[PDB]
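Notes, p. 3: input format for complexes.
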Amino acid sequence: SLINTKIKPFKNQAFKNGEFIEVTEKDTEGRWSVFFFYPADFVFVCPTELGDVADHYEELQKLGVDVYSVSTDTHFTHKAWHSSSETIAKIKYAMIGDPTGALTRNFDNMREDEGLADRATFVVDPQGIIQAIEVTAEGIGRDASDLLRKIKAAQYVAAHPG
Amino acid sequence: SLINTKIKPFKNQAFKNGEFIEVTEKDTEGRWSVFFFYPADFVFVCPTELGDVADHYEELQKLGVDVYSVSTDTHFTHKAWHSSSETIAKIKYAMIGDPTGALTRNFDNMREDEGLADRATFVVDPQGIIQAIEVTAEGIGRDASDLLRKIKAAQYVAAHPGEVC
Amino acid sequence: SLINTKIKPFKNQAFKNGEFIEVTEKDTEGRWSVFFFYPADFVFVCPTELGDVADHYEELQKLGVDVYSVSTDTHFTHKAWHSSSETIAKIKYAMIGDPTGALTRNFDNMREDEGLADRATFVVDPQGIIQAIEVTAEGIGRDASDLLRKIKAAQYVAAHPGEVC
Amino acid sequence: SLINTKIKPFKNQAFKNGEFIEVTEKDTEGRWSVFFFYPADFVFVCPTELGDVADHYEELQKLGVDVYSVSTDTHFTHKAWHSSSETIAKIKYAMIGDPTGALTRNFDNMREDEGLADRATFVVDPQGIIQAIEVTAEGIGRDASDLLRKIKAAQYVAAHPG
Amino acid sequence: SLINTKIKPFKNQAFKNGEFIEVTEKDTEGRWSVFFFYPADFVFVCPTELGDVADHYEELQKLGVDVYSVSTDTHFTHKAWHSSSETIAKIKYAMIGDPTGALTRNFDNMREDEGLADRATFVVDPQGIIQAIEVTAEGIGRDASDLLRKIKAAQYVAAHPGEVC
Amino acid sequence: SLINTKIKPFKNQAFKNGEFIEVTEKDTEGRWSVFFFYPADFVFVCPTELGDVADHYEELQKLGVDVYSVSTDTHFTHKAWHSSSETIAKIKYAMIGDPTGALTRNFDNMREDEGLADRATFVVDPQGIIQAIEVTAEGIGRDASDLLRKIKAAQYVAAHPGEVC
Amino acid sequence: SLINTKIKPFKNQAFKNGEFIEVTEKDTEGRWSVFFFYPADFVFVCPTELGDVADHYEELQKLGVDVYSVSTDTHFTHKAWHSSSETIAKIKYAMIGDPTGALTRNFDNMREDEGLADRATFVVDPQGIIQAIEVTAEGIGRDASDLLRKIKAAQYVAAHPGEVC
Amino acid sequence: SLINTKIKPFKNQAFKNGEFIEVTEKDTEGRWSVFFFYPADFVFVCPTELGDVADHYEELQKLGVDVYSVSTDTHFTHKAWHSSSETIAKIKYAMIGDPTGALTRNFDNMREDEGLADRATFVVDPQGIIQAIEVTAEGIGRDASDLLRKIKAAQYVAAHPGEVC
Amino acid sequence: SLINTKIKPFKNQAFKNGEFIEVTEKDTEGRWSVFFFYPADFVFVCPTELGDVADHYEELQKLGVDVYSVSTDTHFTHKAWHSSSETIAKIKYAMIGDPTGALTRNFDNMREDEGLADRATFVVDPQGIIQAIEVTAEGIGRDASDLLRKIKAAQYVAAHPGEVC
Amino acid sequence: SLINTKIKPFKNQAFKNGEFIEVTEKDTEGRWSVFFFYPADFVFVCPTELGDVADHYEELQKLGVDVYSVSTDTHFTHKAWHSSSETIAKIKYAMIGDPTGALTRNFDNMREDEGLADRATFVVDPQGIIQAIEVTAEGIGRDASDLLRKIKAAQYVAAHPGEVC
Ligand SMILES: [Cl-]
Ligand SMILES: [Cl-]
Ligand SMILES: [Cl-]
Ligand SMILES: [Cl-]
Ligand SMILES: [Cl-]
Ligand SMILES: [Cl-]
Ligand SMILES: [Cl-]
Ligand SMILES: [Cl-]
Ligand SMILES: [Cl-]
Ligand SMILES: [Cl-]
Ligand SMILES: [K+]
Ligand SMILES: [K+]
Ligand SMILES: [K+]
Ligand SMILES: [K+]
Ligand SMILES: [K+]
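Output follows (1644 residues plus chloride ion):
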């Protein structure tokens, strides 16, 4: 896996609380980042995983972690979904659009026969090193609280080596 | 260009009148087809071009011409756009989703830097042969009337070999 | 397609209003150009497409648009055709001869098994960027009016960055 | 990642409750399997991750899941460790030795510059399809209870499609 | 040179005495053939070399010799030239169009930077073997009389082995 | 074999008298070295061979000969084995761990199917040159006495060039 | 063919008027040259082609034209033939020996399965440019009178550029 | 090393007790073999190693072990050396000549810059599997007694599967 | 060298005793052959080597030995030389012409920068095996008497295998 | 053959008149050299060819000619043979050992399936140019007298250019 490797450079468009912005690897430097990948916008399962992360976001602006959700849809589509789904509307973190699939492939997380990303979460430290990885098949949800545990543990070790 | 070449096999999901269907090159054999590519769903420009084709769909269907719009968005996104936009809600033809980019690349129509299809229209005859191509840069609009005129000329020469418009 | 790519360097001989001249990509720099390809001179179909463009040349010249028709025939043949055909005689724009096929291959527009160019039109802006492409099979005519519309829209977008027609 | 792919064939030696046995891909066919990788035997952190999994093993023989722990040490070393560490002594599941690194590389989980496996866990269904993946850097422990959650969810979806 | 090699298969369209026909290597089998290449139709030099061969065509047909003139122009252009040049109008042998240049390249006779054939003449016997070759720069005419002489000498040798003429 | 070749650079962790150290080829330069490879720690055979070398370590050290045992096990495992086995507890020389297999492959001594090193001993002189090699199949024991005799002969010829034992 | 290309550098021995000399491309610079290839010396056919060229040598020299006959025989053999044959004895131009075949291959004129040159004549202008080529099979003689005509036409065109009738 | 690999096919000439014979891998099948390589015949060091092995040959023959000494010298040289050296005269086992170096390279035992074999001994079981390898630099003698010990241990393990000495 | 190898197949023309004949490897089968190469015919050095071989031809024929002299000249040239030179006129063995150099290259005997064969003699036995080779630079003559000696020794060994003194 | 090529660099050990020496191409510079190859030392045939050269060594040294015999045996073996064969004992010139076969391969004289050199003699002038080559099968002796003759003729030509001996 990509555990303990450095994230690669990227430049993508995103939707965040009503505005369109640019996100690059430079925006992660000096912060803790969570890259939350999912298959697609607008499907019919309510996105509890995205919503669950939203519930913990305040607590996530925190201990110092930025959250970037990612799918191969465009930022345009994320904006639409943010206005259509009451669950998605709760999202205050950046929703990255990855139509070329470069971000997804950077994290080796593309389902090539579908053009969609797999359900994978990555925790990246201020130096751009992936410290935790979680991937699940459709139907097996990711628990945000548990994500938080890992992140706290990740932070301790980093300030208390060993 | 791809003029006078045969379309390649494909298999995609599409949104057509409230449902999700599967389209393959098999559905196009024996029929006249229009592959109408566009960059993306939900952009802030009014999808005038797509609605314009909708306006002529009845006459196209009367002439045995199927229409397929294509974007690298998913069919899920097409369903939503169809239920959010007044213009897009007028569409009764299949709205193909091409998230792998395969269909778009079959027609050599990908803006590889952006992961979106260029604004191109292809007219395919019952034998799978491309008989008319139109591509334009962003901001330059496609006139459905011109497309319709071309289709009629194409169908005419097919019926009257060695005779031109 | 070649949409939004830069045209390539080329050097060809041409016939323009009684004279033989040389044309290169350098003559297109800073201007709007229309490259109008067609199969061959002297066939038996009235060359309505070329004459139709000639009818609009005056107006195109007002918009600062140059027109170059292109076939794999020589400039000598274009001169001869310009004196035998009353329709071709109307042409005041450059008729480029492309016997080596290099211009045609630059625009990836050659029918290799025939040694003739496909019926393709390309609109090129002052920076050498292709902004509109139109290709059709034999029998399916190109409407010059639709070409003008496209050129005007192209000029608008270029002078009003961040707008669509 | 390897999410939703089929595990590869393998043949390894292992230690399980006092006996040496052989494990092959054939031993996983028709069962749910958990492949628990770790860096090395005998280091000085008490292996709470391995012990935590042991605590849930009974409950793990279960709902029908076999547990295979894996490191690039030999089975001989696992036997020794099982007699030296009171925590390791609690282990009743198979301890696979992977000295050639083929199992570890099958799961693309080798730290090539060290010759040790990364801390990764994989959940494999009866048909050999990886349904859940978890990887963490040193210092960030894996919670066994949480592993169990994923496995149960994995099992539901598989018997209740969608 | 190609002396004593066998001509290669070819398929070209041609203009011959008012009609468009097809010519292939199969049409040369069992006959004496003259392949007469020239740069282009409609240039401003009198086509006297071609006219000179035309003057001798009667006599060549008596000797059982077929004549094929070849240029990289189309057969459509040969027809036009045949109606425009009083000299070309004398031509009753086949005027082959070679727009793809394959026939010209078969005889290794293409000026690649121009897309035109060099002024080369080849004499081919009933078995498809090249028995005489003549190539000249512009201005150095090819004499049909000398051509006839060579063909008669070639025909003699073929009916009287081990003797030179 | 690797006889008369120079050892390659390396960097490994080892267990030596209660502590963890790092060994590189730098530690061997200027000294006589014995690289004693074995398949694995904790097997049920009494590591008679390793203890046998321990028995001669004092005399080896007196002769300026360092010893390094090597296995693809980690140095953590060596520490444990050293504290579990009476025989292994007698060892005062470095016990190198080679989990990447790099050191073992430098000496072309890997059983690639098993990931364990073959039973081989290498004698390296102060210049890094291999002067004696011994390899045996499982069950065939290595005699430390023979190794000691060889080292003495090796040191002798180094001191008395052009003279043999 | 080699038409309109520059001759390549060469250095050969030759027999000329009772003497052995060296000939190189530098001896052709600034002059009109005729390279006359033939299969072999001493065959039993009267060497009428060489003698015919000999008859016109005086006159060619007046026009400033040098003649070099070439075969893959040595210059030694040319001397002998020049003393044995009454027809060859009239030759006053240089007889080049080409045993390595490098001159012959420069002119692409070797019958590889025989090691002999084909019956080819090349006319080279003062700048080393091949202006006329003639090749024939055995039995089909080369007419010196026709050669002379071509050379005069070549000289004319060169001094009166595009002054065609 | 070559430990636990199968020996390769070979065919060499040899001297054995007054006779010249041929030796191949087929002669080793079903027997225990010792391949004893050394640099060269006739050097000035007493060939103690070879004589030492000869002293143990009787006993080795009892254990069903064949001995083949090998150098890149010819069998002729071995015969000569066997008659000049009182030590070599003791040899009753086959002295293989390997002038082409193929046997030596089979055991990857050639000093390529010298054309001589390194001092290596290999013990091969009835199935052609190398069970012990010993290689030393010049000056470091091989002890035949240690060789015997190894062979006996090798025979034990082979007859008592799952044991170690 | 080619020593102890089999001659290769060849087919050449030759002059022999007033006649032109064909020679192939089949004409050498069952006989002893001498292939005598030399640079060229007609040089001004007295061809003493060929004449020396001629003097011994009778005697070589008694021993059942055929002689083939070879140069890259044609057989036509050999006939001429045989009629002009008193030394060459004594030659009754076959004079092979090798214009393509294939015979000469078969014997690896070509001076590539000259197109001539080196002064080499090869002795070939009834089975086509080269048994003696002699090559010399210009000025260093080949002695026919020494050749004869070698041929007799070759015949002896062939009929009395390893009967050496 | 290698006739008229320059010998290549080499470095070999040799036995010469009781001492071991080194020989390199540098030792041949400025001198006449004879490289005399033979298969092997100690065979059962009398070494008369070598003895014959030995008989002529005095005279060859007067002519400034050095003699190097060469076989793929070692110099150690040459020393032994020189003490064993009364014929070899007459040798006072250098006996080169070529165990790696590089000197033999330099002269393209190796029988690769045997690892022995063919019976070849080469005569090398002061500039390192091979002027005479002689190769024979077993049983066909090389005559030292004929060798001397060739060397004298070679020395003559070298001091009297443009004259053959
Ligand atoms: Cl990963
Ligand atoms: Cl296209
Ligand atoms: Cl295009
Ligand atoms: Cl993975
Ligand atoms: Cl040609
Ligand atoms: Cl080794
Ligand atoms: Cl040519
Ligand atoms: Cl080895
Ligand atoms: Cl040879
Ligand atoms: Cl040679
Ligand atoms: K997409
Ligand atoms: K053309
Ligand atoms: K290990
Ligand atoms: K040897
Ligand atoms: K020749």
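The radius of gyration of chain H is 15 Å.
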